[PDB]
């Protein structure tokens, strides 16, 4: 049926214009709209009826639909525009509209190595036949931080749960990883270790009983 | 002085089929909201006949009340090559379309509603004859009425009624008689009417009369929400029952129960309502619709 | 000023029902249709329902075709979205949104978002553990671990929130058990780790569980 296709992700430097595409049949005829959702917020309409400026949208944003493709152009890109952008068509033949997959636009950027803190189990937890190690990571830009644990220089392959990054109050990102064990698996090993990788940088912390 | 021009008889539906994006204020028209297919009719002096008979039905209302049938096809595509089957009828009309309309409708020679229509993102030109892509305001969501007219229901058979105009050879698309001599040509504002089982009857002179009555469409009813349109059919007749409580003026209370401080709605007699009849070749007849349009007329010299 | 306030979003188990409420202000309820668009956790937007300006047309998404119903009330300026036989994938942030034109139009105003979590887990309180610092300059870091709670939110303050400075609570993780587990870390100068103690206060509202736990 009627399907709208956008780029999966687009990145642009500040100040420079950025262009997002939206594809599909008869886009020339149909009316295409665009919504801007910043993370943890509701989608705000920013483009209506192809070219169309809602009240409260600066000149920096513009919409168009030509040749069979819709486009959203953003000049003088401010960092506060990092967000998701969705196009939407509602054809007369369709009794309900269609949202595009969604472009994910990031501004381009203070790189910074992550920060890792690893905590071993406690006495209260181990006294109840439970072992858990915590790995808290913070202050890394971008958010690419794959985590790998280790046990006596041997790879672990169970008990690990990891949270995807999240924006902090300092524009940076944070994540965590929890490793679940039994006391017999915590004391039988010399030590345990945690590794975070921002860009091949295998930052490692270690604990031991 | 008349505050009830938007309280419509019939459906009060002032939209055309295929343009339903303003149904919230056109389906039905009521006290609140703007409706691009209806509001132009109330611009002072633009539509003097309708404004004199504004509690009667519009063309779109008469179409949606099933008094007037839609032409086949019900819209003509102006962008096309050959054009549209409406082109002959449309071209003989001299019309002025405001900007930002996508559609315009008229009562055709068969007494049915035809329309000219542009594609998406296209607007009618100023003469209502072409479509164009202008980079400007958004388009209206409705359709522009091409003729100044009003309608009512009628069972009066007009199958023997025909246009008769002294000395005219052609008026609009109607060729009245053989004329092989030299003719004069002008655009003229011509009155016309449509009857049950008749074609469009153009007339030399407009002579109308109105018989007032106490039928339901002779009243406008409203309740307090902002004002809201109210269906008179809910009001009990004297000696009968209903689903609401109503009150009104002396005419209303002559036929309906009036409950004064308990009523849910107030109903009053509509200025100008009643049966309008028209004189056609010396005889009074009950038309389906009466109007004016501006058409080419060619007369014997 | 148009405002769309939503409620009824809560934590429910699969198979049971919920009712989302969208109150609307700043415009005429009769002149606009109301849509329901849900966004799954971190996924794309998805139109779910629409009720017309007058309620004559009510359209649903095919994933909830039959299981969901919609209604509206002019006396209350309210739209109800009834969700029977909820499934796990229905877990989303639902937004009620006004539609400008009666059909085939754009959505001009959106609501704050009602979180509907359709997990099969049980309303259970957390378990607190002290994460003690062992052998950074002259500053160490300690805290407490919160384990196996459902559902969010759990608020972990520090000594009646009197230590909020230099305290970060890291986002919980949903294991294959469906339970959340977070951590609360605090950095403190190493010259002060001896005299002052640190007791974090964990509170879980749906399970009615409050605990003040010490660290070493």
From TrEMBL, chain B:
Domain of life assignment: Viruses
Keyword Signal: yes
GO terms classed as biological process: fusion of virus membrane with host endosome membrane; symbiont entry into host cell; virion attachment to host cell
One GO CC term on file: virion membrane
Key words of the record: Disulfide bond, Fusion of virus membrane with host endosomal membrane, Fusion of virus membrane with host membrane, Glycoprotein, Host endoplasmic reticulum, Host Golgi apparatus, Host membrane, Host-virus interaction, Membrane, Signal, Transmembrane, Transmembrane helix, Viral attachment to host cell, Viral penetration into host cytoplasm, Virion, Virus entry into host cell
Cell compartments where the protein resides: Host Golgi apparatus membrane; Host endoplasmic reticulum membrane; Virion membrane
Family: Belongs to the phlebovirus envelope glycoprotein family.
Name recorded for this polypeptide: Envelopment polyprotein
The species this protein was found in: Rift valley fever virus
